[PDB]
Tyrosine-protein kinase SYK (Homo sapiens), 266 residues
Amino acid sequence: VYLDRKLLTLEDKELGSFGTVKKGYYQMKKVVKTVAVKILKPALKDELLAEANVMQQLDNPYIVRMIGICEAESWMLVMEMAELGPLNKYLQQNRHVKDKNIIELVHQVSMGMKYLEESNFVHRDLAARNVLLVTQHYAKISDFGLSKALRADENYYKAKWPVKWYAPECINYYKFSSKSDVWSFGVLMWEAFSYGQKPYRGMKGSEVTAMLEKGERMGCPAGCPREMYDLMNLCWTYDVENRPGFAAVELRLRNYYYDVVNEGHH
Ligand SMILES: C[C@H]1CCCN1c1cccc(Nc2cc(-c3ccccc3)nn3ccnc23)n1
């Protein structure tokens, strides 16, 4: 888990700006591995350790792999690089990405979330900005800074918040479950099919709450298939008990994805 600083080489330029994100390379047994490095500016240190503790436990093709942590100039979290970056920024700059391709990527996120649910972790920050692209056809989930391992005896974690991605039970009762992540996943779907547009544009958190409480939901994105909008709305089931889990969500996406693939060949 504790990486050797002399095996780590950071690039001069910054990828983004907790602190900074930098591209680097970590010298392995034989090969060199391209990495993304989260570099911190007591609370921030503990947050990074807890984050690393979560990632260390996760083993799945659709989740970003942590290489390890390094303590030098600053505290550093070293991850397998996902070269194409955040999904929302990518779709913003690539507006001709095909509908089938969007379905493929969100289905991959649901597979990752299915695993996370089975592992009894709640993500708590599941948004398009936190999906990273390895390729145009390969997405992984990242940013486990708010993530929690659920207690053996409870199906929820009791708590700035990303309010526009949060389910009503999160807002009203501070309770976060895998079902709460399903709600965020609906918002993520909406973002993806809207090519990385922000959800609830021009609205305050309080107005979002008021809107949802009135039974209103965001409209169907341009060119988004009815079946995928139907799934979004199902993810936005107000009552947690009646909201689907990720096993059901992933199945719906898997089946629909296979249908569209058959349409393409035909
Ligand atoms: C840095 C972001 C934002 C602007 C563009 N930019 C780009 C661009 C290309 C690739 C990446 N990759 C990665 C970024 C972050 C990360 C970590 C912390 C915060 C944000 C992102 N984590 N990570 C783990 C694996 N791969 C990445 N980011």
About this structure: The first helix runs from residue 43 to 56. The chain has two domains: 1-81, 82-266. Residues 15-16, 21, 36, 38, 64, 79, 81-83, 85-86, 132, 142 surround 0VG (CB under 6 Å).
